[model samples]
Target: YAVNIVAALAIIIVGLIIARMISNAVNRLMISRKIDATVADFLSALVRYGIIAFTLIAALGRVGVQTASVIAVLGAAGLAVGLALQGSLSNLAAGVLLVMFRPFRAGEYVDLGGVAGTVLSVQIFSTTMRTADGKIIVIPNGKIIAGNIINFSREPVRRNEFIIGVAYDSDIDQVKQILTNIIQSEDRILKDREMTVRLNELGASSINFVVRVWSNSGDLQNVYWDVLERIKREFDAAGISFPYPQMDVNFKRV
Candidate 1:
């Protein structure tokens, strides 16, 4: 009996050392691969817990506990816990899938399931997002996985579109030039894609031209805003008129 207890203690000590070594290796590999620290730490914790659970079972076996019965009891307990945490288990599986597939990474603005924000970190049961107003929201991984994840930063290039209505009398060429100027003036604007300005619609009061540009996904919205502001200010300075919303009035004889 004494020998058995000593043997189990030695095995437990060795297992602890092995677990630590494996965890360190995982952390180093993750860091080298540029994996986010939050993910790395969570993975390491999971591994350690698994190892410790086995070590506990091994220790109990050495102390004269019937391994078969112990396993049965554990299985029963696990069943009850699982039943109570059925929803959370689904989230856990979804979280694992998310980490494995990696559709979106931290700091990427994603619109998924009507929720919009930058993902802060993904955990075992939930994902954290920081909204534009700086509020942190925790969403279940299962729900997030079930919905379409619109990852804006997933594409290398993003299309940006805006429209400005100009006076009917303004020169079409001049308006096109102004639109081009807006695209070229911004430092964040991506040059590799395209910049287009075309007469798209003729409204009752003004001529509407579509101003579209393609930009890097990281800088799309910022560049879009910069160009829009420049177009508004420059167009106004150029004496091009933008009309307010109006309704065409027609009268019929009563």
Candidate 2:
């Protein structure tokens, strides 16, 4: 009995050491391959835990414990636990999918499940995000999987559409030219994609022009501000009137 106990302890100790080494090796391998850091960490943890579980079972068997019956009881308990934690299991599965598919990565701005934010990290059960306002949010992987994910940084170029309204009497041609010039003047704007300036609608208060420009995602915000400021300044200098809501009252002398 004493020998059996000593052997069991040795086995467990060796098993733990081997498990740690293997898990560390996997993490290093993934990092060398340029895999996402979060993914590598999660995978390493999974491997380590799996190995530890197996090692514990093996050590128990070596100490004259009934391994088969223990496995059966564990299996039954696992089933019950799985049934009770279905939501968590679903999240775990979704997390695996997230790691595999990789729709978005850390540091990218994304609209995931209607939560627009920059991704901080992708973890086993949830993804961490920081909103533009500096609020941190943790979203479950299951929710992320079920919702539509919009990755703003995935494509190098993005289209920005703006509808600017002018006075009804404003020259449509002049408006179109001004819009086109604003877009063309921006160095960040991409000429490869189609840029359009069209007369879209004549509203009750003003005539609306639809302007679309493609720009580098990284410089989109700057381009957006520049275009708006430049257009407003140009329009004001040209005496182009922007109409607003007002009731022209007519009072008849009675």
Winning model by TM-score:
2
Error of 1 at 187 (Å): 4.3
Residue 45 alpha-carbon offset, candidate 2, angstroms = 25
| Model 1 regions lying over 4 Å from their true place | 1-86, 203-205, 250-254
Cα lDDT for residue 34, model 2? Answer: 84
State the number of backbone clashes in model 2.
0
Which TM-score value belongs to model 1?
0.60
User: Which candidate number has the best lDDT?
Assistant: 2
- Residues 1-254 of candidate 2 have per-residue lDDT tens digits of 68877887888888789988998899888988887878887898888877776776666666656548557755765787678789988999999989798899898899897879999999999899998889999999989989898889888889888889898888888888878888887878898788989988877877788888888988888888889889889999988987887467899998
